[model samples]
Target: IGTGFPFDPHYVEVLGERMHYVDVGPRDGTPVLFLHGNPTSSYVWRNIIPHVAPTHRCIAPDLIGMGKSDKPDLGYFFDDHVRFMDAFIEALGLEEVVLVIHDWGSALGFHWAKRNPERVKGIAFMEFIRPIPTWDEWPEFARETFQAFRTTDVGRKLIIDQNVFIEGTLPMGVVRPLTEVEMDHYREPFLNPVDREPLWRFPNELPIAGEPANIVALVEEYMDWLHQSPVPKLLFWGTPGVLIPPAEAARLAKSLPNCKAVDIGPGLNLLQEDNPDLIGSEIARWLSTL
Candidate 1:
């Protein structure tokens, strides 16, 4: 997997873990940290790197279990996830970062950004989850799916076991679709039961509302900081994402004073695949604002 990336893989010891990352471009340029979602790793940013790497420093690391990063059986929950992230950030001493975060990465990354707003220059969200959903906006089938993944073993098998890391995400990734060769990279991660375990438990981690959800308090605190901070942000929405409802994404954008939203249709799993330059272009304008 390291050989496949355009940049050489660099390893940094973080809390005893050898976190793997691709560090590309000038060291002194503005730093842009790319954080990925569940199942998929930093590979999601492959197509977007070239366009951004020339002018800005780009660092895309596989969150502990998701990519080439060490996948220990420990620390996969939301709080643990944030600890691992802080370790990664501190190990590299990344400061003034323009964070590009998506999916579960958004949940983890934004919390970290909130905790260390001094280190963040700005944030860009793609198919990211908001703090919670309003009552009228909630859907029954979505709740049913969540309940199954949370309670039943069969739901775990079909959703995460069979499709979480591979088959399921492929179809939802792009509106047009990936070629056969392209599909292989997306499918290879969780090829067996052991490999799929972390993927399975992720659904149960959702902080459904700022209610009785285990991660609720953390979500509320982070959202408060996100709105209060002066960081410039953008919400990049994948037109038909199964995970982040576009409506909720809009609401989150509306909540942040410096945030704007954009939609790139037919690309769900990784919006960068469809609108690779949109971020850099929009971000360039955002940089001017700063």
Candidate 2:
């Protein structure tokens, strides 16, 4: 797992748990923080970090229960993730943050940025979740997948027991085929049902039918923020991505006050795997212009 990953592993005590992260690049450089989503850790940014490390302070943390971080017994609720992320930033004394996020990381990042607008400098994101205000808003396939995955029996069997979110769903979302070694690295953390609790809870947090009021409210709040933020925003999207398809990406770009949308060529939702250097270079260039 560590063979191609060149960064040194580090830990900081945040919110009573040991938070694991990869902190590289110059300490004095403007901080560029990377936040990953479900079933992945700071390792997801392995290829992206190196491109920016020479000029920026690159910081990527394993959200609470995900990678080398401590797995507590508590349910991995959406708010719990925000709390831990907040602690991570505060503990490190990070300021003037430039967030690079995907999946649930986008939600967490937007929520933080809106609340701490003064602290954030810019955002670079892709494959992020957009709120489904009504049942009809979801694509048919997504609705069906979420329905089955949220069901008690199926959800437990697939996510908690088999670790399918990490093993199946994640691999399917990437354009580049994951090597056995890469797969092993992702599967290493959640070896048992107990350890897979976070993965199990994330899908259930999706605001389908607007049922989870709190999460829906949070998403709505950030969606509003996305529309109003004046900070430099770079959105790089690709074809054949399940979440945030072409139409949705267009809508997001129009809503933002200052945004540059880059349509990178065909790839799955996990564009980093298919276009790591491309994504990294684009982000670096955008940050330079900021």
Candidate 3:
């Protein structure tokens, strides 16, 4: 347990494991689920949550084995995360949800939306993987680093042995350098080398070049559904940075039946780090329309 986590510890027994989440806001308010991706926990949304929690039921779960959740010694594959999240939401009995998602979290949210379209009230995304891009699609700056992380042996060495995502990529990805206390909080859960397994597993799960047949199929299906479903969607954009660059976000906005983009200033993969306040305000305003 680290300092500066605003919410108190709360867990639900999901898939025989303790799934931890931050639950706040009015009990009767419509639920808004915030999904954080690799190497981040509910804490990542700490700044944003306060903005929406007063009017909506904001819930952010620590993806399995990533934060305070029980590490069940599983493969931590894409399917693994989906399985636990399904159980967690089911246990909570949330009938309607607005999803605020990022990075790999967007994949999970989209996959869930595809399966349960009726339950998805709205979706707001940033730095997400969609349209299942090719290798050449990655920007020059991040391409090589992502290539090294996606490679099996190389990824294992860099993520597991070296812990670069925590020490290097994370600190580098955000526009404003994280304070020492903040870095320590991020480092708290990843002290053990074994805990970094989820970190290593995430990048490889990216369905680039159709290397992973199963995930490619899943993402493809959800994207088709996303186009067909007239779901109100919000795409938070920043400077032409990492994944979901300005042009990419524009493309997605055009493809979606109902989607709009708002600039969140300078950021990389972790958009929240740079634009949490703006992201939260925009999302809150947009949610008011629903």
> In model 2, what lDDT does residue 216 have?
84
Candidate 1, residues 135-198, lDDT tens digits: the string is 3344444555556666557766866556743675444556665565656766665665676656
Residue 6 shift from truth in candidate 1, angstroms? 2.6
TM-score of each: 0.87, 0.96, 0.96
lDDT tens digits, residues 1-290, model 3? 12266798888999899988999999986899999997888889988888898889999999999878888899899999999999999999999999999888899999999999999999998888765567887677777888899987888999999999899988887887788898887888899898898998888888888868888888899888988999899999888668777887788888899899888888887888888888888888998999
Candidate 3 backbone clash number = 0
**Residue pairs with clashing backbones, model 3:** none
lDDT of 2: 0.85
In model 2, the worst 10-residue window by lDDT is: 1-10
Task: Give the lDDT of residue 10 in candidate 3.
Answer: 88
- Writing each residue's lDDT as its tens digit, candidate 2 over 102-159 gives 9899889989998999988999999887777776876656676667778779988888
**lDDT per model vs. reference:** 0.71, 0.85, 0.87
Clash totals for all models, in order?
A: 2, 0, 0
The lowest-lDDT stretch of 10 consecutive residues in candidate 1 is: 132-141
Candidate 1 deviant stretches above 4 angstroms: 1-4, 133-143, 159-161, 209-212, 243-251
